[PDB]
Amino acid sequence: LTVSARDAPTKISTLAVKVHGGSRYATKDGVAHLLNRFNFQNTNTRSALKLVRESELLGGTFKSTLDREYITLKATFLKDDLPYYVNALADVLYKTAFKPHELTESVLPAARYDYAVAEQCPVKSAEDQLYAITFRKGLGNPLLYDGVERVSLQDIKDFADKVYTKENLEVSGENVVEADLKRFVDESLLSTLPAGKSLVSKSEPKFFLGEENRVRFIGDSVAAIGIPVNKASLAQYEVLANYLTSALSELSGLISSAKLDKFTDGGLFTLFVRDQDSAVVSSNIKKIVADLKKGKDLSPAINYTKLKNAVQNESVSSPIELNFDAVKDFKLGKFNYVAVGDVSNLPYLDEL
Amino acid sequence: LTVSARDAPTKISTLAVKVHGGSRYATKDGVAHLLNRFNFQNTNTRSALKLVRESELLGGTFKSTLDREYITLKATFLKDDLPYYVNALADVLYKTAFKPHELTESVLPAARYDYAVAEQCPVKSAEDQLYAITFRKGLGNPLLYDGVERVSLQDIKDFADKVYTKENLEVSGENVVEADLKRFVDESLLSTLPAGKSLVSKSEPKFFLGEENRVRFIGDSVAAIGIPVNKASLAQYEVLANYLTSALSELSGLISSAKLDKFTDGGLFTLFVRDQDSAVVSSNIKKIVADLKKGKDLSPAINYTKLKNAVQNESVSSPIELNFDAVKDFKLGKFNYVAVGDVSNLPYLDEL
């Protein structure tokens, strides 16, 4: 129950409850996706229809987002409607109904739609293959439920009992008085959640290097590399991720995408080359790693990196605050590799 | 044009033209499968309907089978109808029509059915993953067409006149007079075929060891190990394959199956452990590798596998002529490993 708020002279407020309950902490494969798709169904006192109708008549919307580390419950609204949305989020966390007819009618088809639209992108396929071969049963758990191991409703209730605790959540408001928000998150049902324990680890997530995975796919072909990053080398890989997709590099005509996912205890640098034929993406990824194995100076891209990091941490005000000033050179060491698509024409890891 | 036959005082003859045109020799992925499904469509002088409705009245059937090395064109018939069937198979090899309406109406739906029936068995998935991670671009080709790289009709015609050459085929006849078969294979259209090159290579197929692959799948989970075998140690692994499935071994209740695919330049020993829940598959495959990493005395199973080899060389007549007597001991070295199914609970190659 960390409660932080950032005031503004502005019409629209937003309010996010972030719990550490994402796919990192999934006891079964995809129980976090089903809890996320379950989030704003009906509670004991208010139906899910009544919440949507009353919030529309009051002027706001709810959303629930799932990433690897978090489950986020966001509410965007007009500024002086704050305690309604606080009590709505508190009721969603405290007392959700967990009915089998809501599992089988509205939650499971929504999750099936989510997985069916994430399968069609070979970049997300390669990204989760990358996560799975770098970290195995920590962050390598799958993001979305695909029914490979069957998740019953009692599993969803048990996962919600595990992660919806008082020590595992953060209340984060934007354009809202902090004294009013702090008065409204006690005087509530957030202050009678179980004071469990916070599931975040302070250790290192036990990475793996030199791994390779190839999956066939009809459509675009994607060759991807991935490098696990510890905590102290985070700024260097962020300057690399902004250098490789900018005009300073010779390689962004070849690199389709490149980013760095940052967590509390490290991160993963991902690079994706994508095209519709395999000769182009093969020669491209060979050129990328052949000229990343020779060094690159990244000190041109430091100010550009400070700019992009400012514009992408303007949104959330719990960022990581890297330094960026002590980064000079990069040389590619060992890395994990994923082929997706026409895998018998994409290169292997020992050919890179 | 090696013609060989073997008489018998019986009623059913069986001709076979076997072509070195399997997946190992495929140019694009699944061209051997599409040529195999194309095989008995219509020729330039006789329709595919006329062939079936005259072969039924003469009393015989045609078939054509695909594996990694061969495309086999088999004709099972009543004994004194032999020149009809040698001219039928000669017409199929020499002059088949290759019409695009035949590609889009018969051959592509038949191949789609073959892929969809082999996709549901997780042992076929694990076997092709095993082949692909052991051998990479020769024998590790995909066996069936699944449309990841698009095969045209001109690709099928090019593969057909690449592999349907006079030096790349054998003619083998069960219950056939050999003098009359040799007289009927010349004075035919197997004399007009191009005297091309024989595609079989007497090298070693360049295996890879220590590889691992994990495939998501809904249903039964399979853990498979695979060991490439040279020409010398072929029979030690055959004795091992017949020892592990017989009642001599205490591991026969844990092993779903175990076999050794033999070629003219070595082979692959595959072992599959399959059920419906990942805890039993993990426990069993850990027990299998922990027992095989210690020694196994294979000398009890020698006469048993002499019988088994006689049995399985009654059906085929591809004799590899193995020793079986110098086989004394086995100890597992390095091996490739495939986990198909609930791969978040199946063990990795680290833990085996």
Add this chain to the structure above:
Amino acid sequence: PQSFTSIARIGDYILKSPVLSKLCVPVANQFINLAGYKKLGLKFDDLIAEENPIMQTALRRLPEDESYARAYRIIRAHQTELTHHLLPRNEWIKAQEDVPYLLPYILEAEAAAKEKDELDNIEVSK
């Protein structure tokens, strides 16, 4: 076309009263016995007419084993009256077995539909 919330409201007011429960429940039990649906092997919730969206949602939300038992009791009732007999006396639905099983599903679907039609005719107090 009387809603089950009305039936449940009147019935609960009857059953929680001291006087008229002890008068009105024996005549109800005699009414149930003389109805004679139990002699055909049917519980009462098999008798509710199902061609309306409330009962279709309740039968869709009914669990899988109860639905198979209900389907067998209906097919057995049709086969019994097709022969103009009754079920034998050991096959009659007993009084402790005649439970309301579809009633919570019908009641929650009816409450959801009434809340929906109250929200569709809502009026803000401005």
Add this chain to the structure above:
Amino acid sequence: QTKALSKATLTDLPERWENMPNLEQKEIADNLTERQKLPWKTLNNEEIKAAWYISYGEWGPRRPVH
């Protein structure tokens, strides 16, 4: 000392006793005569139904007149 018979050759004897291939009628009468020599609290009540029926059942000579 002859112990009890199998369950699954004497379950419901009084209805399949006459569809009986007639050799095993003998090798089911004799072991019941053998089993009767024990103390009568030994016997399970499946055979006491069967031993009564072979003696006193309405079959063979005790078939009804119509």
Add this chain to the structure above:
Amino acid sequence: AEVTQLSNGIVVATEHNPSAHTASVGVVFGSGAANENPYNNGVSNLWKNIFLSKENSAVAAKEGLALSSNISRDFQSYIVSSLPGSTDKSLDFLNQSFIQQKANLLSSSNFEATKKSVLKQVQDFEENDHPNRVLEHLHSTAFQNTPLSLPTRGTLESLENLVVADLESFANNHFLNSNAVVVGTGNIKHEDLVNSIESKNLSLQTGTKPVLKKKAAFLGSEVRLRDDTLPKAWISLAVEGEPVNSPNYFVAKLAAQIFGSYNAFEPASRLQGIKLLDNIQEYQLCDNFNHFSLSYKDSGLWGFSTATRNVTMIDDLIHFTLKQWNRLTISVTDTEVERAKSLLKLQLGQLYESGNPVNDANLLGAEVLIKGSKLSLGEAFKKIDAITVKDVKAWAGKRLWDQDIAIAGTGQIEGLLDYMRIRSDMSMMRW
């Protein structure tokens, strides 16, 4: 070709084939699952599976012997196959563990493990193998309350009451010298087999099997094990057919071969010369069919089985195949008979003349056990070549035209009509 002799109590039959590389001996009894009650149903399955235990088969594997066995309606066999020089190791094994010293096989802690795996085996049969379980249900509703109505694997409710006393009781009643043929196929010669079965003085048992009090009678009936959670609809449907040693045995085989088998997904199975295909192909009525002629000792079965996913047009599939059956009585052509003759000669040649000598042992044992000898393949071909169109028309007027049928179905068989519409399809109103 086949030779068959009679020792002091045992009949011995061999099919010597000197170009084979395995030899295979064994004993074929004459009491399959048609010699059981509804209460010891599954005894022959338990004997099949305690003959193939791991500790019984390890002893055979150390000597290079491979065990095989088969439970059918009429017969049951127990076959030991090995290399051609080691036929007497096989005869020694079959004697010393199955015939005389069967007290180690019937151990408890072996019976319990085998009974547990047989229970698991039939439990996975009854809920996963759909065409064969409706063929067993067609048998169990066509021949009901007669001994041919029993499933060969047994029943989960029946099998869990079995003990070792039932197995040894069945062994005493049926594993006899009067009931058994000792078979030898592969390249074992006959004189060596009789010399080594009189060298050892092999004797099985000395009684005589009980004779069943009622014969199998075909009852026109139906059974519907419908299950809407399955993808397809599996339907078997049959009339009473010819038993073995009929004069109309090969006419029934030929009349089933006229309509043949079909697979919707093999392109050379769509081009066959059957006139049923150009009625069921236009709307894709079925996935597959096969027309069978099952012959037993008492009675027989003649019919077909289909699996279809077109669950809305099951009744027209049934209607079109039964209106094709009517043509056998009325208007079967010369050409259909010649085509079925050639295909039947091919099918029998592939069945008998095959490389496997286990299958030859099963076939030779059942044939010599039921009729004292074995009809050669040349005489079978000369009996197939003599069939005319009038023989098919006479047989179909006798056995097919307007006869009672037996139906079994599972899956989505709501679209399958009742007994009376299908039975009224069995005879058209002469148009």
